Specification:
It comes from Mycobacterium tuberculosis (strain ATCC 25618 / H37Rv). This is Phenylalanine--tRNA ligase alpha subunit. This protein has 3 helices and no strands. The protein binds one RNA strand of 73 nucleotides through helix 2 and helix 3.
Length: about 50
RNA sequence: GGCCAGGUAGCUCAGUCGGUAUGAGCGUCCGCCUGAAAAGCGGAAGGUCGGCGGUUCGAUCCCGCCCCUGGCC
């Protein structure tokens, strides 16, 4: 199982950093697809059904 | 007032009684291509699955109410 407490924490850190680095709304839609969509690493944590 | 059967992407519609709707056709975007296009090929974006709540670590899928449609009255 690849869902250690140090795995989800680092994945969110890369997500919140890219979300905070989103300067315009068009970049936020790109970051949302890479960190909150159905293909994001956090989605893979939920893809592991 | 009765059990039901339906509301799902921009349009028209499939599909699951619990963790991915690997949704389809068309519509939108990018690349190859063209003077510029389209088709073709190769990549993608986009749904909070009818609303408000209830159970659950987790609900499009189960309880309740209602919003709106047919059905049969």
């Amino acid at each position: 199982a690849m869902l250690s407490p140090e795995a989800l924490t680092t994945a969110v850190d890369a997500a919140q950093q890219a979300i905070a680095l989103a300067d315009t709304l068009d970049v936020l839609a790109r970051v949302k697809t890479e960190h909150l969509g159905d293909r994001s690493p956090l989605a893979l944590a939920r893809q592991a059904l």
